[PDB]
Short mmCIF file of C-alpha atoms and ligand atoms in Angstrom, two decimals:
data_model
loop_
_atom_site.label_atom_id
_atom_site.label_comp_id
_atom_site.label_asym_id
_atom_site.label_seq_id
_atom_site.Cartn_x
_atom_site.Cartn_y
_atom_site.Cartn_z
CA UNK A 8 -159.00 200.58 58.49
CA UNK A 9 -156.40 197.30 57.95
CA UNK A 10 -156.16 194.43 59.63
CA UNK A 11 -152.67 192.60 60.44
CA UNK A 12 -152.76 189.12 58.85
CA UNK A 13 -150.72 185.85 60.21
CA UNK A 14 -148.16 186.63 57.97
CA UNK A 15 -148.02 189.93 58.61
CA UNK A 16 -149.34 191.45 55.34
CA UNK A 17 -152.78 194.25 56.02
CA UNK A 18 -155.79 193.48 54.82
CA UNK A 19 -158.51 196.81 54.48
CA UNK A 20 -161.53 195.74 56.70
CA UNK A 21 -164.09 196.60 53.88
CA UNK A 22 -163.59 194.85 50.54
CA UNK A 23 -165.73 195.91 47.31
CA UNK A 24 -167.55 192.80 46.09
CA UNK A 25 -167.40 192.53 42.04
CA UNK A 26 -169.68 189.85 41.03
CA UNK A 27 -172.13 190.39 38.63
CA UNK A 28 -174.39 188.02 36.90
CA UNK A 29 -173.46 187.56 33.18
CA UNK A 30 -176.97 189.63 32.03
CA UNK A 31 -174.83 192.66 33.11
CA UNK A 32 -172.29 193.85 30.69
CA UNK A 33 -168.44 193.06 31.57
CA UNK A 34 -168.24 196.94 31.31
CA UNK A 35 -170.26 197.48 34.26
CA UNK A 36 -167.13 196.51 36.51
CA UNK A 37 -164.69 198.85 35.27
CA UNK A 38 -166.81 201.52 35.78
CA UNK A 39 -168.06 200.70 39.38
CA UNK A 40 -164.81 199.37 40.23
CA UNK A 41 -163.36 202.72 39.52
CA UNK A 42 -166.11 204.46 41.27
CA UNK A 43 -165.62 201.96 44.39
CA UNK A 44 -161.50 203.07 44.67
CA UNK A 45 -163.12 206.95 44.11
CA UNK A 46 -165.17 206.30 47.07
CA UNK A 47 -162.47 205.24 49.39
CA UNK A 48 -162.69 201.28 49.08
CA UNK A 49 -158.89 199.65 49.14
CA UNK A 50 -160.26 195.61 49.23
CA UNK A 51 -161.42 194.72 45.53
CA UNK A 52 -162.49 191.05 45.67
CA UNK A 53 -162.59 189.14 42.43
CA UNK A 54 -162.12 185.70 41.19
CA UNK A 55 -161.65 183.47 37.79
CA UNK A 56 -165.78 182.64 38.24
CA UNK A 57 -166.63 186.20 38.07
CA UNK A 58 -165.06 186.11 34.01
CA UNK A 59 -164.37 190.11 35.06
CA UNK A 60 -160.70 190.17 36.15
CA UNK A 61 -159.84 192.12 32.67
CA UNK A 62 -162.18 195.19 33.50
CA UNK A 63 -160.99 195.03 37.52
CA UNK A 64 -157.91 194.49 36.95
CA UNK A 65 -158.15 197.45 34.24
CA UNK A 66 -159.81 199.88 36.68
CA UNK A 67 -157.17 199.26 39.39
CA UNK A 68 -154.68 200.06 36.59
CA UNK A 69 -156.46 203.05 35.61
CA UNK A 70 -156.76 204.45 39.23
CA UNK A 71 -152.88 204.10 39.38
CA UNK A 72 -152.60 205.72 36.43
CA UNK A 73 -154.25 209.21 36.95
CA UNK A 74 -152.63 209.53 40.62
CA UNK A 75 -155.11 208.04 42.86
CA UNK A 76 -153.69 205.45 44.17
CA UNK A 77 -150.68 203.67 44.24
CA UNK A 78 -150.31 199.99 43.97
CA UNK A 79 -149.25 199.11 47.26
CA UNK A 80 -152.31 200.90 48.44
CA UNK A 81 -155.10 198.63 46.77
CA UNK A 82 -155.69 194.75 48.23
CA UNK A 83 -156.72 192.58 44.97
CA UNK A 84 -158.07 189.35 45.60
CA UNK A 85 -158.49 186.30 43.38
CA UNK A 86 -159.65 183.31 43.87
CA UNK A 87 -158.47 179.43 42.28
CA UNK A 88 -161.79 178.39 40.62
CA UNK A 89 -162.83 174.87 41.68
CA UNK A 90 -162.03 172.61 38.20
CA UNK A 91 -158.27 173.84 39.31
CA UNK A 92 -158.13 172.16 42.21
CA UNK A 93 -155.72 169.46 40.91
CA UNK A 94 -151.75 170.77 42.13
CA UNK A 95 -150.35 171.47 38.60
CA UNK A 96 -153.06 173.46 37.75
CA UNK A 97 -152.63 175.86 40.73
CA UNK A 98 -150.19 178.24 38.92
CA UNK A 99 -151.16 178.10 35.63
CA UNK A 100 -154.47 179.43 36.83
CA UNK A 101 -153.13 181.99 39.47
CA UNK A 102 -150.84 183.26 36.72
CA UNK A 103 -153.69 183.57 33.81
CA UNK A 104 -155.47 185.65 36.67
CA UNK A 105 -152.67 187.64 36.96
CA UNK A 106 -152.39 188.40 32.97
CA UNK A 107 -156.04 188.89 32.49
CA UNK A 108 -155.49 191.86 35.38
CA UNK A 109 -152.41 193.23 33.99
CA UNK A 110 -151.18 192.85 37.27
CA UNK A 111 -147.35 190.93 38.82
CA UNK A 112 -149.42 190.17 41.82
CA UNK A 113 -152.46 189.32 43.69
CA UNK A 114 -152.62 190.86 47.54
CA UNK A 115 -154.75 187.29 47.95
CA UNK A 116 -155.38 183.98 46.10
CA UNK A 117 -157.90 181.73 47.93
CA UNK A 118 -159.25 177.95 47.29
CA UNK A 119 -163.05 179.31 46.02
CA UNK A 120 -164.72 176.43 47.25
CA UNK A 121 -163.63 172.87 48.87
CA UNK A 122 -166.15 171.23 46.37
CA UNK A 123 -163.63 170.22 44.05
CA UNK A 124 -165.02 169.87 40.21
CA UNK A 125 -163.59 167.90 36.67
CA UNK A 126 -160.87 169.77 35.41
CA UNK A 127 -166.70 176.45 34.95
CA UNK A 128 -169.75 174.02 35.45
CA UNK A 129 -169.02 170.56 33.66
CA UNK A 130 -171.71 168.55 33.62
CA UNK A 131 -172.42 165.20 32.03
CA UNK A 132 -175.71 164.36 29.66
CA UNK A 133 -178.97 164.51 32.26
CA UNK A 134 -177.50 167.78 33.61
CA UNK A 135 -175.76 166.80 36.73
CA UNK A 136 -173.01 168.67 37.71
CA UNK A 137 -169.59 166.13 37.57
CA UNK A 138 -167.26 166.49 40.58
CA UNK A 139 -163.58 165.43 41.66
CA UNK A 140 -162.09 163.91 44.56
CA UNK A 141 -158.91 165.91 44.89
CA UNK A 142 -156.46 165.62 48.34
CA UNK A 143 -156.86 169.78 48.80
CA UNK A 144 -153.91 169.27 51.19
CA UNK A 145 -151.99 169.04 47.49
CA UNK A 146 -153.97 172.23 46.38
CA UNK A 147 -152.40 173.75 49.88
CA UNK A 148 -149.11 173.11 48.88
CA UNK A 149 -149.33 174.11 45.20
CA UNK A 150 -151.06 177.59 47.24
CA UNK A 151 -147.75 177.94 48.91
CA UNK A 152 -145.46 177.49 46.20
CA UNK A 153 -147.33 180.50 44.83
CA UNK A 154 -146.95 182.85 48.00
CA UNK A 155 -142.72 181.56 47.79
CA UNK A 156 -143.00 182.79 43.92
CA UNK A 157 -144.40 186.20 44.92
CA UNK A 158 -147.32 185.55 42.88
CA UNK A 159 -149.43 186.16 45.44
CA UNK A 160 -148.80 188.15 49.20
CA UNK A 161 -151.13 186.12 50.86
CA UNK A 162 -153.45 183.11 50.63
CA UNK A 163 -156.34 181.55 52.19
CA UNK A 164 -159.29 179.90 51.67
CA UNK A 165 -163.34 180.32 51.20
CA UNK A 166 -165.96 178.07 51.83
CA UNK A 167 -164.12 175.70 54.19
CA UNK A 168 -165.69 174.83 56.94
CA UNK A 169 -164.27 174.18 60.41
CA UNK A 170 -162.80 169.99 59.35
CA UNK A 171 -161.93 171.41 56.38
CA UNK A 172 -160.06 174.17 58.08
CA UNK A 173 -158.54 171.41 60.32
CA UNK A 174 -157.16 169.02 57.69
CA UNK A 175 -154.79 172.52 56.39
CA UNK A 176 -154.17 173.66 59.67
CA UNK A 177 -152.75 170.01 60.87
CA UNK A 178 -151.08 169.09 57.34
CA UNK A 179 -147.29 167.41 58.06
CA UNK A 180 -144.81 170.27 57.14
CA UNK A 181 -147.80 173.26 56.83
CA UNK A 182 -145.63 176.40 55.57
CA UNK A 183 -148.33 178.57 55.44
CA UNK A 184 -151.73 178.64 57.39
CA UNK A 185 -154.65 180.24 55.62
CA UNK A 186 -154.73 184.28 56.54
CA UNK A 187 -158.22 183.93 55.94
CA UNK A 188 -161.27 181.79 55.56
CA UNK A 189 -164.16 183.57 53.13
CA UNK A 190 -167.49 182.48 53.83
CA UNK A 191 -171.46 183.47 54.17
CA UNK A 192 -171.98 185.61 57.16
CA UNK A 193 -174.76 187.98 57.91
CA UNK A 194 -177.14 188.33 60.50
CA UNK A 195 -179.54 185.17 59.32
CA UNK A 196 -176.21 183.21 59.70
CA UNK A 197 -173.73 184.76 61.60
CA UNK A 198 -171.36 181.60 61.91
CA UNK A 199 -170.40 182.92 65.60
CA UNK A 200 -168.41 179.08 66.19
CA UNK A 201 -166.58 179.06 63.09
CA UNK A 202 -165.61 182.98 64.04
CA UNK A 203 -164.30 181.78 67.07
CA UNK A 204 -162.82 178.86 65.73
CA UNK A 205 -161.00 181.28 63.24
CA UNK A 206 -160.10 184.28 65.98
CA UNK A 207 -158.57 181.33 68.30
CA UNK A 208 -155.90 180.62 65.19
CA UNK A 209 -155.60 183.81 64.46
CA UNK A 210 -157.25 183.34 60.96
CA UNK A 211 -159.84 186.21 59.78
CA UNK A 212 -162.87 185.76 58.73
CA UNK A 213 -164.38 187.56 55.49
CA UNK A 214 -168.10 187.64 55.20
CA UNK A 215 -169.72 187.51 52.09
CA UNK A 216 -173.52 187.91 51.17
CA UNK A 217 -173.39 190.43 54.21
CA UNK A 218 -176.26 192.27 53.02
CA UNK A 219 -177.80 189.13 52.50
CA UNK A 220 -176.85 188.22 48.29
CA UNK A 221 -177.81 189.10 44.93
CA UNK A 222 -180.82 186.50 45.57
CA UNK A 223 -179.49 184.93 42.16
CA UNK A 224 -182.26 182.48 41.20
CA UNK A 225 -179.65 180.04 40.17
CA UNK A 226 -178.78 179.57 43.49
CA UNK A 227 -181.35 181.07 46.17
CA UNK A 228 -184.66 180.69 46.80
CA UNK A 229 -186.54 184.24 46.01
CA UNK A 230 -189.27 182.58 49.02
CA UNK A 231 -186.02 182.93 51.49
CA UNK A 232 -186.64 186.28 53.73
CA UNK A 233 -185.01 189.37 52.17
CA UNK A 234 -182.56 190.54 54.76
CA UNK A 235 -182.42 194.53 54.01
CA UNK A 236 -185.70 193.67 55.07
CA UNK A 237 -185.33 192.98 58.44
CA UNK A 238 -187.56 194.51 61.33
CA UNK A 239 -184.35 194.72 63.57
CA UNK A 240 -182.04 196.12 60.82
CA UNK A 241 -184.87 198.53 60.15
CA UNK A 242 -185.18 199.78 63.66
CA UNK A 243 -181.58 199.90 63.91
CA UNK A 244 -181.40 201.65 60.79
CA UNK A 245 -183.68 204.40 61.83
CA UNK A 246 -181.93 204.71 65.35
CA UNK A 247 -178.62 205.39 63.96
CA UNK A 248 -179.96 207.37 61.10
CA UNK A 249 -178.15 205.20 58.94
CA UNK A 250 -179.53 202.42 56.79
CA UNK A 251 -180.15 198.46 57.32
CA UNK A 252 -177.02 197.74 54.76
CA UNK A 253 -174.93 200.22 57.04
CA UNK A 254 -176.13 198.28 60.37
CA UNK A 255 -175.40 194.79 58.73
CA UNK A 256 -171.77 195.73 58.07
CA UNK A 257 -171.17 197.65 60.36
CA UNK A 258 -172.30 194.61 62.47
CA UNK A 259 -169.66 192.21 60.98
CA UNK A 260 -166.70 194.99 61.74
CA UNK A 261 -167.74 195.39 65.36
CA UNK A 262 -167.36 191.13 65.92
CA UNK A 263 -163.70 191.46 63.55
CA UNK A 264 -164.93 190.12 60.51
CA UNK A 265 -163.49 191.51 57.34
CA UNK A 266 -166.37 192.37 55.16
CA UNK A 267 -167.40 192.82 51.45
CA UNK A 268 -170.09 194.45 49.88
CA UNK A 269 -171.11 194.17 46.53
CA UNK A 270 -173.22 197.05 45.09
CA UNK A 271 -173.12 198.30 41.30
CA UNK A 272 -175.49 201.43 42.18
CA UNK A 273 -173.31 204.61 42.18
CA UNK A 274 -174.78 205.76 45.73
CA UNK A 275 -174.57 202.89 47.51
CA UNK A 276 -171.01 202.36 46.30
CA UNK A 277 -170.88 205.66 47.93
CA UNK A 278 -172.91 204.96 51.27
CA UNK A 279 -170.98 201.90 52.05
CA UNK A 280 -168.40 203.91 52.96
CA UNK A 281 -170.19 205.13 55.46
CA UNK A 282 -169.52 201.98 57.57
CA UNK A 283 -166.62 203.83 59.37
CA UNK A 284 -168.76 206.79 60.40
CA UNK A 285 -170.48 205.48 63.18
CA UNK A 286 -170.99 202.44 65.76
CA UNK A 287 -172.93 200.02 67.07
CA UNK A 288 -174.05 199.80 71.41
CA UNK A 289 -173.97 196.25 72.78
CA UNK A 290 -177.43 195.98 73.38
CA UNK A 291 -177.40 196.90 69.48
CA UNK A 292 -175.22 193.92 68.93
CA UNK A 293 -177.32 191.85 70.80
CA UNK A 294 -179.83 192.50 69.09
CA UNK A 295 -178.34 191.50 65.42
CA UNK A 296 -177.02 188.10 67.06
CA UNK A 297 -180.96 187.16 67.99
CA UNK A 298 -181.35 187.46 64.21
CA UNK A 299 -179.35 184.05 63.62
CA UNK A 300 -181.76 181.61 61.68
CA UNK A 301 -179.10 179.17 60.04
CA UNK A 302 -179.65 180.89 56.98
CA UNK A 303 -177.68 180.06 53.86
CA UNK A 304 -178.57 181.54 50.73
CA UNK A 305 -176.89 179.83 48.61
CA UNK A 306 -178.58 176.89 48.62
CA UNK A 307 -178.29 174.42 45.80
CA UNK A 308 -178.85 170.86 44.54
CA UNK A 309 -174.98 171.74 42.93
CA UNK A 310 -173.78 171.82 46.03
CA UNK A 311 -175.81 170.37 48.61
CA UNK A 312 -175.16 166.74 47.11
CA UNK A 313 -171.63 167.18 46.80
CA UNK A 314 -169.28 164.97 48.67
CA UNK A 315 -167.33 167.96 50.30
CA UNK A 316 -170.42 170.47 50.90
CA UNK A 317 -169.37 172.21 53.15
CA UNK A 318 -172.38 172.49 55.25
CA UNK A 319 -172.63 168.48 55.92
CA UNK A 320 -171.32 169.44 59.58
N1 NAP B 423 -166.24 183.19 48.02
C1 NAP B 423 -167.51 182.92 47.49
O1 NAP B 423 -167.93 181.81 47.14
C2 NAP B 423 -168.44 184.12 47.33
C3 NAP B 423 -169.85 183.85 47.25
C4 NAP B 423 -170.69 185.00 47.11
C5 NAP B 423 -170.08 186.27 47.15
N2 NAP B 423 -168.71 186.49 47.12
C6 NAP B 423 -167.98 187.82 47.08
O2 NAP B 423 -168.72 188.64 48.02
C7 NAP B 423 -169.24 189.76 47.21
C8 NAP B 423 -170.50 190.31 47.95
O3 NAP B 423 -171.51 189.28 48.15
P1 NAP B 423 -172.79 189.23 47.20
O4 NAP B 423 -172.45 189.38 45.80
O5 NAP B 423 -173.53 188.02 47.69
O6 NAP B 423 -173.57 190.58 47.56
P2 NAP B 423 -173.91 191.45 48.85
O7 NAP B 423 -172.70 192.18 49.24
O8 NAP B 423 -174.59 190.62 49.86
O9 NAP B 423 -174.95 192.50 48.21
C9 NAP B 423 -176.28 192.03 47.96
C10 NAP B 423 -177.00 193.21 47.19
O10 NAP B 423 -176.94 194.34 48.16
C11 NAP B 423 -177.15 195.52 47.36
N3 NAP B 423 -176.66 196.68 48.12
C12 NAP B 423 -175.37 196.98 48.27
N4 NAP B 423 -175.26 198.06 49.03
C13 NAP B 423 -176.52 198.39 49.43
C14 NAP B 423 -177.01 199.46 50.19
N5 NAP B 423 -176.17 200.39 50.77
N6 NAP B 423 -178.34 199.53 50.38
C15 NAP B 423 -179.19 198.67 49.76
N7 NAP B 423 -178.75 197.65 48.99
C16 NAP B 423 -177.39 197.53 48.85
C17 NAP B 423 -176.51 195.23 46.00
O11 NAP B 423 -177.42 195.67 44.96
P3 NAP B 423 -176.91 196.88 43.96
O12 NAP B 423 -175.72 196.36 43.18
O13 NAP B 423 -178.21 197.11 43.18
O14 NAP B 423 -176.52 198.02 44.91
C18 NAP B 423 -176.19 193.69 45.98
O15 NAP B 423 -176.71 193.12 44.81
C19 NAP B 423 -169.49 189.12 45.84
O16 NAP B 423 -169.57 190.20 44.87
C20 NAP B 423 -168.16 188.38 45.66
O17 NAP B 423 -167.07 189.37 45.54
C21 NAP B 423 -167.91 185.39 47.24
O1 VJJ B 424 -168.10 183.88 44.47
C1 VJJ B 424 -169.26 184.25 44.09
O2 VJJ B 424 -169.60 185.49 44.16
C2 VJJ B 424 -170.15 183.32 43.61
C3 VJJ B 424 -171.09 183.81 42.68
C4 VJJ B 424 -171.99 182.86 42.07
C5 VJJ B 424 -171.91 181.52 42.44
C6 VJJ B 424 -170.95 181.08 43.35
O3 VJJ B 424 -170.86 179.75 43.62
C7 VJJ B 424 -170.42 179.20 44.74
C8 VJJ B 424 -171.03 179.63 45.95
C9 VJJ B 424 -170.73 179.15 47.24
C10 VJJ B 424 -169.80 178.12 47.26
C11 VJJ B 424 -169.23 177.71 46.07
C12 VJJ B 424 -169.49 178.16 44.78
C13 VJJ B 424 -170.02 181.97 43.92
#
């Protein structure tokens, strides 16, 4: 249920997603991150945004603690937030991370986002969000420096799109490539070239908003069509006996994505699991690709106007 990376750390295939917007208490994600390792996930994918590394990092803990696990056995990811961008600030930030988990390591530290910001949201006096032009070929290096340190096994990068991918991949004296690039995928936008792109330098890609996003209204338009909705998921769903959620990651798993899921529901902590329980047919597959609509969800004047969006190309 791993997958080798480029520098030869594992990576579990299904990662439990732990955002949650701030009207849910912070002590909503120790509790389902506990119940996530309980239900068999090993992935736990966090980040400085998600202002919840304490109670992850504390559930991990506590699942070491009474036996379950051991640490070697759990992947923790975080992830540089994007007013950090700036070199010197790389470490500082990867090792208050690394405090507010309780932790001497992260299995992962990624880049969040290319869209680099003044050093969560700064903003000037009309409202508009205030960026920073930043070489992230520095931010690469300062990444590295990390992974020599041992602060972090691995690192990669999320939201980078295929140029952006390019400029780290072709830097002068590149230690390290990126083990992984973390982006939207699902079956309204299944980035099949920048999959290809990735398999062909042996990078993997990790899907997130598989099951199609929290619809946050900060973000996503609630018109945008619901995809646990879908017709094809549906009939898919009721074919396997399974459930559209199940068929949309199980989906990603089948093409070699890594894939998260976020749920803070008990059960369907419980039925994502089930992803490993059954598979897909071609025609099956075929029929999820036809779903592609170019499809982002996340889909925001704060990014959409920023001079490193990363959906310009
Ligand atoms: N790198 C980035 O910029 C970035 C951006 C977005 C997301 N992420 C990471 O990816 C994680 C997952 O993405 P996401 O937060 O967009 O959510 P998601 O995984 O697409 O989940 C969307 C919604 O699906 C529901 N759900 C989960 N399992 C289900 C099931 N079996 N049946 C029916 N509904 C189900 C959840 O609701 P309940 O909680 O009510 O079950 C969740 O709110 C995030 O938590 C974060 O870790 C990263
Ligand atoms: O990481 C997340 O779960 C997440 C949650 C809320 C907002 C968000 O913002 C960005 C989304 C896409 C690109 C850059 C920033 C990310």
């Amino acid at each position: 249920q791993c997958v080798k990376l480029n520098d030869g750390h594992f990576m579990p295939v299904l990662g439990f997603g732990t955002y949650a917007p701030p009207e849910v208490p912070r002590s909503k994600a120790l509790e389902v991150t506990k119940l996530a390792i309980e239900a068999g996930f090993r992935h736990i994918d966090s980040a400085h945004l998600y202002n919840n590394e304490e109670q992850v990092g504390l559930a991990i803990r506590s699942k070491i603690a009474d036996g379950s696990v051991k640490r070697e056995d759990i992947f923790y990811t975080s992830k540089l937030w994007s007013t950090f961008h700036r070199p010197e600030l790389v470490r500082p930030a990867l090792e208050n991370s690394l405090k507010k988990a309780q932790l001497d390591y992260v299995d992962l530290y990624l880049i969040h986002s290319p869209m680099s910001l003044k050093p969560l949201s700064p903003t000037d006096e009309n409202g508009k969000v205030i960026f920073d032009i930043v070489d992230l070929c520095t931010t690469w290096e300062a990444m590295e420096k990390c992974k020599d340190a041992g602060l972090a096994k691995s690192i990669g990068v999320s939201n980078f799109n295929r140029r952006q991918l390019e400029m780290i991949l072709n830097k002068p004296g590149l230690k390290y490539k990126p083990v992984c690039n973390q982006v939207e995928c699902h079956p309204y936008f299944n980035r099949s070239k920048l999959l290809d792109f990735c398999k062909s330098k042996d990078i993997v890609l990790v899907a997130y908003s598989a099951l199609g996003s929290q619809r946050d209204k900060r973000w996503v338009d609630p018109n945008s069509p619901v995809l646990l909705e879908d017709p094809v998921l549906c009939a898919l769903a009721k074919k396997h006996k399974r459930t559209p959620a199940l068929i949309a990651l199980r989906y990603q798993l089948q093409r070699g994505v890594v894939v998260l899921a976020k749920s803070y529901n008990e059960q369907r902590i419980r039925q994502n699991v089930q992803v490993f329980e059954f598979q897909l047919t071609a025609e099956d597959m075929k029929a999820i690709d036809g779903l592609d609509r170019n499809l982002h969800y996340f889909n925001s004047d704060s990014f959409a106007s920023h001079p490193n969006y990363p959906y310009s190309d």
